[PDB]
């Protein structure tokens, strides 16, 4: 450990949590954001669970993660859905949530450095 969030929290706990936040924060998309597997070059975030305003596009989430990570302009990074799915930056996060959310109700995302993918 640390392991993936899915392995640190039972499915039952994750399902329950999602039901509750959606209840308390109906306009927020619940997002798990973790480092891509074996990624060591980019830093870990202070928090794993994000509450993302549902009217926003992917690009707004990317700009936020970029700022959470404190990357300088020269560092490029990927924000992938699930294991390695590329998501258009003009795509609404509510749409990605609908198509790609887990059975437990979270949307899972991972980030990786350009070096991880050979750039």
């Amino acid at each position: 450990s640390d392991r993936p969030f899915k392995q640190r929290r039972s499915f039952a706990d994750r399902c329950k949590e999602v039901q509750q936040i959606r209840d308390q924060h109906p306009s927020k998309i619940p997002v798990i954001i973790e480092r891509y597997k074996g990624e060591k070059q980019l830093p870990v975030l202070d928090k794993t669970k994000f509450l993302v305003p549902d009217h926003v596009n992917m690009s707004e989430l990317v700009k936020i993660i970029r700022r959470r990570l404190q990357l300088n302009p020269t560092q490029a990074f990927f924000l992938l859905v699930n294991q390695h799915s590329m998501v258009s930056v003009s795509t609404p996060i509510a749409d990605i949530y609908e198509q790609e959310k887990d059975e437990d109700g979270f949307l899972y995302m991972v980030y990786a450095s350009q070096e991880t993918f050979g750039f």
Binding site: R8, P30, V44, F50, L51
Partner: peptide, 20 residues
């Protein structure tokens, strides 16, 4: 360093709105 699994990182509107 290891991330807190307990608290949500709430992305605010104000955070979205800046810098612009």
């Amino acid at each position: 360093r290891p991330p807190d699994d307990a608290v949500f990182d709430i992305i605010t509107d104000e955070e979205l709105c800046q810098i612009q």
